[PDB]
From Swiss-Prot, chain B:
NMDA is probably regulated by C-terminal phosphorylation of an isoform of GRIN1 by PKC. Its phosphorylated state is influenced by the formation of the NMDAR-PPP2CB complex and the NMDAR channel activity. It comes from the Eukaryota. Belongs to the glutamate-gated ion channel (TC 1.A.10.1) family. NR1/GRIN1 subfamily. The chain holds residues 602 to 841 of 938 of the full protein. It is linked to Neurodevelopmental disorder with or without hyperkinetic movements and seizures, autosomal dominant: An autosomal dominant neurodevelopmental disorder characterized by severe intellectual disability and developmental delay, absent speech, muscular hypotonia, dyskinesia, and hyperkinetic movements. Cortical blindness, cerebral atrophy, and seizures are present in some patients. Residues 4-14 dip into the membrane without crossing it. Changing A51T: In NDHMSD; uncertain significance. This is Glutamate receptor ionotropic, NMDA 1. The gene is GRIN1. Changing Y46C: In NDHMSD; likely pathogenic; reduced localization to cell membrane; changed glutamate-gated calcium ion channel activity; mutant channels are activated at 40-fold lower glutamate concentrations and 50-fold lower glycine concentrations. Changing G17R: In NDHMSD; loss of function in calcium ion transmembrane import into cytosol. It comes from Homo sapiens. Changing M40V: In NDHMSD; likely pathogenic.
Curated annotation (Swiss-Prot), chain G:
L-glutamate binds at S91, T92. Contains an N-terminal domain, a ligand-binding domain and a transmembrane domain. Agonist binding to the extracellular ligand-binding domains triggers channel gating. A hydrophobic region that gives rise to the prediction of a transmembrane span does not cross the membrane, but is part of a discontinuously helical region that dips into the membrane and is probably part of the pore and of the selectivity filter. Residues 18-27 are cytoplasmic. It is linked to Epilepsy, focal, with speech disorder and with or without impaired intellectual development: An autosomal dominant, highly variable neurologic disorder. Features range from severe early-onset seizures associated with delayed psychomotor development, persistent speech difficulties, and intellectual disability to a more benign entity characterized by childhood onset of mild or asymptomatic seizures associated with transient speech difficulties followed by remission of seizures in adolescence and normal psychomotor development. Rare genetic variations in GRIN2A may be associated with susceptibility to schizophrenia, a severe psychiatric disorder characterized by hallucinations, delusions, disorganized speech and behavior, cognitive impairment, and social withdrawal. Heterotetramer. Forms heterotetrameric channels composed of two GluN1/zeta subunits (GRIN1), and two identical GluN2/epsilon subunits (GRIN2A, GRIN2B, GRIN2C or GRIN2D) or GluN3 subunits (GRIN3A or GRIN3B) (in vitro). Can also form heterotetrameric channels that contain at least two GluN1 subunits and at least two different GluN2 subunits (or a combination of one GluN2 and one GluN3 subunits) (in vitro). In vivo, the subunit composition may depend on the expression levels of the different subunits. Found in a complex with GRIN1, GRIN3A and PPP2CB. Found in a complex with GRIN1 and GRIN3B. Changing K71N: In FESD; no effect on localization to the cell membrane; changed glutamate-gated calcium ion channel activity characterized by increased glutamate and glycine potency. Changing L51V: In FESD; likely pathogenic; decreased localization to the cell membrane; results in increased agonist potency and channel activation at lower glutamate and glycine concentrations compared to wild type channels. It comes from the Eukaryota. The chain holds residues 599 to 690 of 1464 of the full protein. The lineage of its organism: Eukaryota, Metazoa, Chordata, Craniata, Vertebrata. This is Glutamate receptor ionotropic, NMDA 2A. The chain crosses the membrane at residues 28-48. It is found in: Cell projection, Dendritic spine; Cell membrane; Synapse; Postsynaptic cell membrane. Belongs to the glutamate-gated ion channel (TC 1.A.10.1) family. NR2A/GRIN2A subfamily.
Amino acid sequence: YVKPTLSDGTCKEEFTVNGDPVKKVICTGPNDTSPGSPRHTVPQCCYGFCIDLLIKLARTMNFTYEVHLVADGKFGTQERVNNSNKKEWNGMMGELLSGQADMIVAPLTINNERAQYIEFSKPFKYQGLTILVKKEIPRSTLDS
Amino acid sequence: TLSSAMWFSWGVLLNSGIGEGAPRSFSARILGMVWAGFAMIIVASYTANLAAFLVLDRPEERITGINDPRLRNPSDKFIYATVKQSSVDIYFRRQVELSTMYRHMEKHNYESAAEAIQAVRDNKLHAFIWDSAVLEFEASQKCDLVTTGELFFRSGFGIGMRKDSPWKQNVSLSILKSHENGFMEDLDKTWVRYQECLTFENMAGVFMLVAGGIVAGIFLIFIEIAYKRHK
Amino acid sequence: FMQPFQSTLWLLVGLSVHVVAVMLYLLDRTLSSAMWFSWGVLLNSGIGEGAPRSFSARILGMVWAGFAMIIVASYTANLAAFLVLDRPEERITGINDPRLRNPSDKFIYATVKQSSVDIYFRRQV
Amino acid sequence: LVTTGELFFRSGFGIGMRKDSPWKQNVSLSILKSHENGFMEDLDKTWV
Amino acid sequence: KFVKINNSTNEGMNVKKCCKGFCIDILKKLSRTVKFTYDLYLVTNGKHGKKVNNVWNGMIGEVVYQRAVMAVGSLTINEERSEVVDFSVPFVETGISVMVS
Amino acid sequence: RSNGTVSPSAFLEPFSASVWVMMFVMLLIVSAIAVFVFEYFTIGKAIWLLWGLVFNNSVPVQNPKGTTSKIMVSVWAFFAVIFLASYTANLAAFMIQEEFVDQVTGLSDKKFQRPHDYSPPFRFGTVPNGSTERNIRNNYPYMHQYMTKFNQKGVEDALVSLKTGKLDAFIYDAAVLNYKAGRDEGCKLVTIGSGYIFATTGYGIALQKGSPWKRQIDLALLQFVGDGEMEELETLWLTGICHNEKLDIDNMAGVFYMLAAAMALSLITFIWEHLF
Amino acid sequence: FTIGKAIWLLWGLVFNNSVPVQNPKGTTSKIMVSVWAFFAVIFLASYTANLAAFMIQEEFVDQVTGLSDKKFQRPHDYSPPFRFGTVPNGST
């Protein structure tokens, strides 16, 4: 979950029904979001399933995190570069094959092409595709 | 007694039992009884037809899975979705039949994940292909849509790393232990497990007529009184 | 007859109707005439010989008539549901039916010990 | 009795004879000719 | 296909079009099993086949005059067709049916 | 479950809500209007006649008599006919549908925490020297200390004994459980949860530690997943018999209790009226 | 009048009880009237159920069968001239 930070830059003051504060971290993603603007990369607020998993992993292990949101937006794919004859990785996977890299954590997917370059771990979820359509409006109400 | 006989005949078909008409002719009484039987048969047939229409009311034939013939054959009535052309689009490219079907969504793929659901909520599109968890949560939280079909290309998620980093073994062992510890189910229950979710119009489209008739009854009584007074 | 739901169900319903009528007539303080009128009303005989005493008895009779109409509607719905559920035994669909693909003890079949069906089944592993 | 269910392994009948025989081509041609001139239809109508 | 324009400009080269369908799958399966290689090519000289002035034109002609070996496609078995070429066993059913509105 | 799960749902109707109150007040207003029109002591008789015409046409009353009153009575009769037809259609639709609830719907249930002080003692069905037994023992021992009483030899014997009624619950793997239940005799067996899994972990191929085959095997298996061959394999080899394919005595208990309560309330009202 | 009243009461009990009369006298008459009313109610409920179940059936009409027909065999006359479309130079 991504939310704009507090005006003072201390996004806080959230709690759950069970009386448990929500653990939160601060990202440095594209503040302007839409392309073409002069990217601000102002701090924001991020929290969710993956954030909790990362917190547990960091507590069990011994390291520190500096979460920063992706710059492009695409999940990641191989594509031929324009005006050339080669191909490369774009999207969020692109930052994996550069200095940023580290320990990418996100709703990724285990694929053959992806696994040929990077190595995954044992999955923490299981999913299908489940085609989705808009619900039909029930016009059978015995009006007439 | 002509007006009373007419009122009695009108009320017979509605089980009023006024009993204001006793025709002198025996054949007239026999014809009236036959007509009452015909009216009873007709109203029973109408009730049976209404019950059958209510029972068999199902004009929805939404595409179930990818192998459905309607979904297999592209059509210009509505278009498909691809969600930023990532992850799933590779799966569609790999299969030759899916490669042929990809001509429909090749030029119409979106660029994000929420834009497609917003456009669906704008009724500009009724189709979507995405991870089952995300779509299920969207259906549960937003009590406006339903997901229909059978799961396919089942492949779990995962934490990515680079080449061969010195943290892989510990991370994978921690994930497996967290699975076997019951922590992961607890977390999945606390994050996405509870998101909110004799017809009234049947008694509304008929009670309005009853109210209108009740209102017009006063006017009809006044008109009848005026007609009686004028002659 | 009134078999499909339960014969004991109809017996209990009749006993409850008679008990309700008996309490209703006790509340009046033509008991046989009232009982016949109630039986005709619940059977749509339309005797019209009932003579209620108090308005509470009238309200109880109206509630009982509504309950009887609800019971009649439920019985007709059950009859329609049973009519819709006709042909309880389905039809085997070729060789692709799992219940015939999986052998059991209640289904038995065989063609001929020397024929073409034998060859077709033996060759197809 | 009833004959429910769809059908599988569709391959029609035929008249058999040994690998070498002088009647082969003539027999096949005669069957085709009678068929199409409208003979198997009449026989099917009058016998089955 | 032997592409030809119009009038005297019909002198054209062998354009390369790729064709697929039900019969082509049968052809590919036969190529895989019997182990032969083929040189598929469309015909532009007529139709399925009709005898005019004691001459055959279209598919059947291309097999009668030793200009081909097989004639895979939508051919139909018949009496006069089978007196000049040899057919295989049928693999589809077909008759003469009627369609109306 | 020993017997089939049937829920009459005598109160699941959308009645007893603001719609019912609106219908009641509309009925009262119509009755009052009819009484006024007839008058233009009979209020009770007219109300009874209207209530009968709504419910059953065997209610004799002479309160309404006229032309406009006749029109109102005919309109009310048509409205009641439409209402009862709609109710019958709704009952038919309800009979089309079904309502089945889970038996326990919980692995960390109260039942599997202290079944000695809850009903006759329950049954724990496992097998020894497995993977489920190790995890269950390591998570919370008490269930294992209880579970030593019942631990069968295999799967077929345990299922047969359970069908004999000796046991109540059998806890084991997921894939074999789904296959067994799907291909059961008569589809009389089902999992407690609606396909609910607890500790999701997949199968695997146990290669040697550092064996020079892991990369090729993993890539080949992922490729097999990608091309959809596993879907056809599962369809051919893993499919159950049924799976997705699928006014009584106890149905009228609630309405009968409501009728008894209404009769008691009417008796109380009559007693109060007699007091005054 | 007793015969006519009894006939009218029987017809009403079969169809609809909106035609009451003082025909039956005695306990036996009331019992038989109730029995007839119950029988008619059961018969009407069964008829309604059968009518409701009838809607799950829908037949079709094919009329002629094949090329052997008066419209087909007879080339001309009839009244509207017919159409016999077939693509030439084939097998059909």
